[PDB]
Amino acid sequence: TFERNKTLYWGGALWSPPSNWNPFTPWNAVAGTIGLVYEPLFLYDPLNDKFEPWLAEKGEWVSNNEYVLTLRKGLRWQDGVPLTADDVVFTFEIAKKYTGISYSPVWNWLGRIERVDERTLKFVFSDPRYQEWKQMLINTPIVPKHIWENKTEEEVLQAANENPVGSGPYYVESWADDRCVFKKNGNWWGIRELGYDPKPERIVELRVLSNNVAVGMLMKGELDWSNFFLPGVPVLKKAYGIVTWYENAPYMLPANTAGIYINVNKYPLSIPEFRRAMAYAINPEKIVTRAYENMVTAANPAGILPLPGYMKYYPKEVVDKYGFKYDPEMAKKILDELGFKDVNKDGFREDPNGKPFKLTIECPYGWTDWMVSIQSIAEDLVKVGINVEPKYPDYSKYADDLYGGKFDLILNNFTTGVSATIWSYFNGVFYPDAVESEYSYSGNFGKYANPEVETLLDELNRSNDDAKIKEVVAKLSEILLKDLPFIPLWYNGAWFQASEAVWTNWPTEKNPYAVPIGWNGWWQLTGIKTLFGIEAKHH
Ligand SMILES: OC[C@H]1O[C@@H](O[C@H]2[C@H](O)[C@H](O)[C@H](O[C@H]3[C@H](O)[C@H](O)[C@H](O[C@H]4[C@H](O)[C@H](O)[C@H](O[C@H]5[C@H](O)[C@H](O)[C@H](O[C@H]6[C@H](O)[C@H](O)[C@H](O)O[C@@H]6CO)O[C@@H]5CO)O[C@@H]4CO)O[C@@H]3CO)O[C@@H]2CO)[C@@H](O)[C@@H](O)[C@@H]1O
Ligand SMILES: [Mg+2]
Ligand SMILES: [Mg+2]
């Protein structure tokens, strides 16, 4: 049995049976595969807007189109093989050869990677996409050449990669239908080279079928670290000693923009004015109150996260002029203009030819707050005569629906999260390559096309000037508000609560040494630093 005071029980990110640890497919890999096992060149600290060199010792643009990366000495894979610049070169170059790899488009703007010396690389760009490069530095996991280099593309993309060999502080000890057990690598290079020493001997990542199940686990100290949404936080804190980021309401940091992606290839969702009608029909405040007990705030119409590094580009003129707000009369007005009228007194508008139509809205089953939220959204839409039914596929079906574009309306936040650049938000909304691609893992899940938007995304991407960025953000926001491929509704929380029954010194507002979120994508946003600060109450 695992000794209690050396074991960290964590959940909130495991919504399918653990079966994949492939760093090339983080959408399917067990959360923590990126972070615990495979590592990035840099972390990004969103609390302070700062990069922390991780595998890298340093990185800088030495010219308009050359980025010099210096790797730390003494880096090592979990199998003892040195991790070197060879592996970084390979991580990028494998995607030149194998276009099926998700980040293969990097080679449309990266020209070559020069080896300067033993630990230094010079990335030379044909098209220096500064904003997108920031994201690559924290999101691209470095993989071992000596393990992956002889695999075919099918092998690379399909491999379950059981017993993954990464360079990180934990490896996989065991797994089963309800858990993945990570075990500490006592020889992790980071101990010597960074002076970080992860405290848990084991991290047990738990799966539950619904947030409902996690409540009792946290209450009883069976769960230490929760990245679940849990209701009734005031009671958890008062009666069970639960800690959160903020001591008082709203308790939770914002994490991302939750909104509705719309299948623009399904009638009548193809009609931009119909999408604007839906936006006017929805009451985000009812969601904020009913689902979240005011732990979140409603989104501004552009969906720009209420953080300083984003809000410095807020397009107030554009939003004042082109924004939407909750107004059922305006929704009814537009629907009537479009000819969608109830001809049979069933409370549902038929189409202009008198035919019925109805739509689905979906979220993952067991994501209890999103279930309540899409019930609320559906109710709002039905109230102006749009027949919308909530559906709760399991996470895996939800994800296949999302990535494959097989939905009507879908509540999502996967690409609209906290990042090093506002470019990632607009890319997460508009991702042009989604349109012709079978699956999209990068955004624009409803496959909205707009050639003008593509040029603007690139303009923003290529800019390093605040004035220029502000100008382009305004143009992008105007098109977002006119065509609404994505309807922003609220900022979903960075859900974090912890039990102090075993582990203490959690990071909080007053002790902000890490952002304690272990969802995929968040280890590199300093989730990993959680592990070096927590303290086991008892030896
Ligand atoms: O409140 C509701 C419930 O919340 C639960 O917790 C949720 C949480 O709220 C949130 O939904 C979270 O979402 C995860 C998600 O599960 C998934 O892991 C997701 O993974 C993303 C990832 O963040 C990136 O967006 C990634 O984008 C990359 C692309 O895949 C691709 O590699 C791309 O490659 C480009 C390349 O880098 C280069 O730029 C080149 O030029 O072009 C390439 C192509 O574009 O690079 C992208 C960026 O790196 O995609 C994946 C998949 O979309 O990450 C989010 C965020 O964490 O999930 C959790 C649950 O796990 C619970 O709290 C529950 O209790 C609540 O009820
Ligand atoms: Mg307290
Ligand atoms: Mg009718």
Side-chain angles (χ1 to χ4, degrees), residues 1-191 193-237 239-292 294-324 326-344 346-405 407-435 437-537:
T1 300
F2 305 148
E3 54 274 76
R4 186 58 182 93
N5 304 308
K6 296 195 178 81
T7 308
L8 182 67
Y9 292 90
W10 162 60
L14 186 57
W15 294 100
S16 61
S19 71
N20 184 282
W21 298 263
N22 191 324
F24 290 99
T25 61
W27 49 93
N28 283 339
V30 173
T33 294
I34 310 306
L36 299 176
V37 182
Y38 297 95
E39 300 177 299
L41 295 171
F42 293 82
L43 313 184
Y44 177 75
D45 174 8
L47 301 170
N48 299 293
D49 186 21
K50 211 171 206 184
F51 290 80
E52 184 180 334
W54 199 255
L55 290 169
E57 170 193 302
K58 58 170 179 172
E60 64 175 334
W61 291 93
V62 298
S63 77
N64 70 292
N65 78 321
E66 297 162 300
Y67 184 92
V68 174
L69 178 76
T70 307
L71 290 190
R72 296 177 184 278
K73 303 197 175 173
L75 307 175
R76 211 167 39 247
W77 297 107
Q78 283 161 355
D79 59 9
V81 173
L83 187 161
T84 78
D86 287 9
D87 297 297
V88 179
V89 169
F90 174 80
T91 295
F92 282 86
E93 296 199 338
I94 192 187
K96 175 156 59 178
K97 181 188 185 184
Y98 293 163
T99 47
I101 293 174
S102 74
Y103 54 91
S104 70
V106 66
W107 289 103
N108 292 333
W109 45 283
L110 172 64
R112 69 187 177 266
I113 308 172
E114 300 183 356
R115 188 60 168 271
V116 171
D117 59 29
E118 190 63 48
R119 57 199 189 94
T120 309
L121 300 174
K122 184 162 77 178
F123 293 79
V124 181
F125 297 85
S126 64
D127 171 24
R129 296 179 180 182
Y130 303 119
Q131 304 302 321
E132 188 169 5
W133 183 243
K134 288 176 188 182
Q135 292 301 111
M136 292 205 77
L137 289 171
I138 66 175
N139 284 336
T140 315
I142 305 308
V143 301
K145 183 179 185 177
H146 71 280
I147 286 168
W148 295 88
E149 69 182 329
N150 290 320
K151 302 197 180 300
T152 67
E153 191 167 9
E154 174 179 70
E155 287 190 271
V156 169
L157 294 176
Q158 299 302 318
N161 196 37
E162 295 180 3
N163 307 293
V165 179
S167 58
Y170 292 80
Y171 62 90
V172 180
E173 185 181 65
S174 67
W175 64 96
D177 196 51
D178 66 353
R179 68 195 58 221
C180 183
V181 180
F182 294 94
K183 170 70 175 55
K184 180 181 180 179
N185 181 13
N187 289 328
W188 176 50
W189 68 266
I191 296 164
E193 307 304 330
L194 304 178
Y196 289 125
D197 205 339
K199 302 304 183 296
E201 199 59 45
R202 286 181 179 83
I203 303 167
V204 178
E205 183 167 12
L206 300 168
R207 176 185 171 215
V208 298
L209 299 180
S210 163
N211 294 338
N212 296 338
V213 184
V215 169
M217 302 178 73
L218 191 70
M219 282 176 172
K220 293 173 65 160
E222 296 166 339
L223 180 62
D224 296 306
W225 184 12
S226 165
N227 295 140
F228 297 97
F229 175 83
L230 307 175
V233 170
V235 171
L236 291 173
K237 302 199 75 172
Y240 301 93
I242 300 306
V243 296
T244 58
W245 183 264
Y246 294 118
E247 171 76 321
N248 308 121
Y251 304 117
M252 316 294 166
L253 291 164
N256 45 62
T257 300
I260 304 168
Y261 286 91
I262 300 164
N263 183 351
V264 300
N265 286 102
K266 152 105 173 179
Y267 182 89
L269 300 173
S270 50
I271 304 166
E273 279 294 289
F274 189 96
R275 303 196 295 267
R276 291 204 78 244
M278 293 196 293
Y280 280 105
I282 297 164
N283 181 359
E285 290 305 328
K286 183 159 54 82
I287 291 160
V288 166
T289 301
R290 182 191 290 177
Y292 295 106
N294 300 120
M295 290 188 294
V296 303
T297 60
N300 59 61
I304 296 166
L305 277 166
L307 298 172
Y310 286 27
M311 289 301 293
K312 62 174 173 178
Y313 308 121
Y314 191 75
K316 220 205 71 139
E317 300 86 342
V318 163
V319 171
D320 284 347
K321 188 177 179 177
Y322 298 113
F324 60 92
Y326 172 59
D327 186 346
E329 297 296 333
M330 175 64 72
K332 291 169 77 251
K333 186 178 167 58
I334 293 164
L335 291 167
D336 278 347
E337 277 175 29
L338 295 175
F340 289 75
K341 295 174 181 179
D342 190 9
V343 293
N344 53 5
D346 59 7
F348 307 128
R349 291 167 188 271
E350 284 61 55
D351 71 12
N353 293 315
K355 299 300 192 299
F357 77 98
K358 60 178 182 178
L359 305 167
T360 59
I361 184 171
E362 65 191 85
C363 76
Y365 176 76
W367 291 18
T368 55
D369 55 314
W370 279 18
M371 293 170 68
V372 173
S373 295
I374 65 169
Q375 288 154 19
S376 190
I377 291 160
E379 279 154 9
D380 288 347
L381 294 167
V382 168
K383 187 55 65 177
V384 298
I386 302 174
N387 196 351
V388 178
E389 295 175 317
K391 303 294 187 174
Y392 321 104
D394 69 23
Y395 179 85
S396 291
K397 170 173 177 45
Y398 167 88
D400 185 68
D401 290 351
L402 180 76
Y403 299 139
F407 55 82
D408 293 341
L409 308 178
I410 190 159
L411 176 64
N412 187 250
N413 65 353
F414 284 6
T415 62
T416 56
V418 167
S419 74
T421 174
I422 198 171
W423 174 89
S424 74
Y425 172 70
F426 289 102
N427 195 52
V429 169
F430 285 120
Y431 185 60
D433 285 353
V435 173
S437 292
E438 303 160 345
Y439 284 89
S440 172
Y441 309 101
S442 298
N444 188 22
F445 301 110
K447 301 189 180 299
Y448 168 84
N450 187 320
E452 189 177 358
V453 160
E454 316 182 20
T455 68
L456 297 172
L457 285 177
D458 282 5
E459 184 167 22
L460 171 57
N461 206 346
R462 292 167 181 148
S463 184
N464 197 20
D465 168 88
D466 270 343
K468 185 57 128 63
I469 291 175
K470 184 175 171 47
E471 175 185 285
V472 180
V473 163
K475 291 177 183 180
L476 284 161
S477 296
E478 179 170 329
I479 296 168
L480 176 52
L481 291 173
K482 290 184 171 179
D483 276 355
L484 293 166
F486 174 74
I487 302 173
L489 293 176
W490 69 94
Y491 308 113
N492 217 52
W495 311 126
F496 165 68
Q497 327 83 13
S499 168
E500 288 196 306
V502 175
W503 296 93
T504 62
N505 197 43
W506 290 93
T508 67
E509 178 189 24
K510 299 307 175 58
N511 189 32
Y513 67 84
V515 182
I517 305 289
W519 299 328
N520 177 60
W522 282 81
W523 291 92
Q524 56 265 49
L525 293 173
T526 73
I528 193 68
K529 293 178 73 171
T530 308
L531 301 179
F532 315 126
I534 55 179
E535 286 165 22
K537 265 174 104 114

